[PDB]
Every structure is written in C-alpha cells, then in structure tokens.
Amino acid sequence: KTVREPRIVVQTTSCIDILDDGYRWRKYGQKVVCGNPNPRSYYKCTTIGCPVRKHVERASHDMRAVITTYEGKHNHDVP
Amino acid sequence: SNPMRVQTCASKFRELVQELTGQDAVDLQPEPIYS
Ligand SMILES: [Zn+2]
C-alpha cells in the first residue's frame, strides 16, 4: 500500500508560522533547516494514549510560506 | 500575489490527504502580473 501515514504534509501561507489545528500539543524539540532563520519545532499530542506527532516549519524561498508535517492520525475530535 | 490561506487546511479530516493537497503546494489561480 502507498506510504503516507508517517508524512501527512499540510501547506498554508501566513504572515507568521504560529498556526491552529484544533488539537492540543507539547513540544519535545527543535532542529535547523536551510534558507530560513526559524528552527523547525517538533510536537506530540497531550491527549491520553495518543502517539501522534507533528513538525512545523517556514520555507526557504518565502517569509510567507509555512508547512506542517504530521505523523499518525488522532482518533479523538476533542482537542 | 494570492491571499494568505492561513487556517484553510486546519480541519479535522479523517483521511491521509487533507482536501487542498497539492505538490506541497501551489496557488491554482491565474497570475495578474509576471512571475
Ligand atoms: Zn491526539
């Protein structure tokens, strides 16, 4: 079957990389990327028994472009 | 320019692919000036 669940990617445009998604999160770390001053930050769900992650980044080629990458799905609709 | 999409894909979809999934991505609209 085609691999996607590890690397659920979501793009948007915004004056900044602070964005909402209707879930609740803690941050566990951060790494550097090419072509942009901001770090990529990584998060994990704070719902009980939920092993979902994401990482969030601005792009190199614009101030205004922003991407989130999720890993696994939340079986919960409550934040 | 095309306008700031901000929250447009922040929905709680079930699938592996959010409804506006592209090449991670481009504005599909016609450019009123040169690129
Ligand atoms: Zn969760």
Curated annotation (Swiss-Prot), chain A:
> Where in the cell is the protein located?
Nucleus
Cysteine pairs bridged by disulfides in the record: none
Instruction: Provide the residue positions that the database annotates as binding Zn(2+).
Output: C45, C50, H74, H76
Top-rank taxon: Eukaryota
What effect does gene inactivation have here? Answer: No visible phenotype under normal growth conditions, but mutant plants are extremely susceptible to the necrotrophic fungal pathogen B.cinerea.
Posttranslational mods: Phosphorylated by MPK4. Phosphorylated on serine residues by MPK3 and MPK6 following infection with the necrotrophic fungal pathogen B.cinerea.
Tissue specificity as recorded in UniProt = Highly expressed in roots, leaves and flowers, and at lower levels in stems, siliques and seeds.
Please report what switches on or represses expression of this protein: By salt stress. Induced by infection with the necrotrophic fungal pathogen B.cinerea. Induced by infection with the bacterial pathogen P.syringae pv. tomato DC3000.
Give start and end residues of each DNA-binding region.
14-79
Query: What does the record note on quaternary structure?
Result: Interacts with MKS1. Interacts with ATG18A. Interacts with SIB1 and SIB2. Interacts with VQ1 and VQ10.
Query: What family name appears in the similarity comment?
Result: Belongs to the WRKY group I family.
Briefly, what is this protein's role? Transcription factor. Interacts specifically with the W box (5'-TTGAC[CT]-3'), a frequently occurring elicitor-responsive cis-acting element. Involved in defense responses. Required for resistance to the necrotrophic fungal pathogen B.cinerea. Regulates the antagonistic relationship between defense pathways mediating responses to the bacterial pathogen P. syringae and the necrotrophic pathogen B.cinerea. Required for the phytoalexin camalexin synthesis following infection with B.cinerea.
The protein's name in its UniProt record: Probable WRKY transcription factor 33
- In the complete protein, the residues contained here run 343 to 421 of 519
Swiss-Prot record, chain B:
User: Any phenotype upon disruption?
Assistant: No visible phenotype under normal growth conditions, but mutant plants show impaired induction of some defense-related genes triggered by pathogen infection and treatments with salicylic acid (SA) and jasmonic acid (JA). Increased susceptibility to the necrotrophic fungal pathogen B.cinerea.
- The stretch of residues making up the signal peptide is none
Q: Which UniProt keywords apply?
A: Chloroplast, Nucleus, Plant defense, Plastid, Transit peptide
The motif VQ: which residues?
Answer: 13-22
Q: What induces it?
A: By light. Accumulates in response to infection with the bacterial pathogen Pseudomonas syringae. Induced by infection with the necrotrophic fungal pathogen B.cinerea.
Q: What is its main location?
A: plastid
Annotated membrane-spanning segments are: none
Any one Gene Ontology BP term: cellular response to light stimulus
Quote the function comment for this protein.
Contributes to plant defense. May regulate chloroplast metabolism upon infection with pathogens such as Pseudomonas syringae. Functions as activator of WRKY33 in plant defense against necrotrophic pathogens by stimulating the DNA-binding activity of WRKY33.
Mind telling me what this protein is named? Sigma factor binding protein 1, chloroplastic
Q: Which organism is it from?
A: Arabidopsis thaliana (Mouse-ear cress)
- Its gene name is SIB1
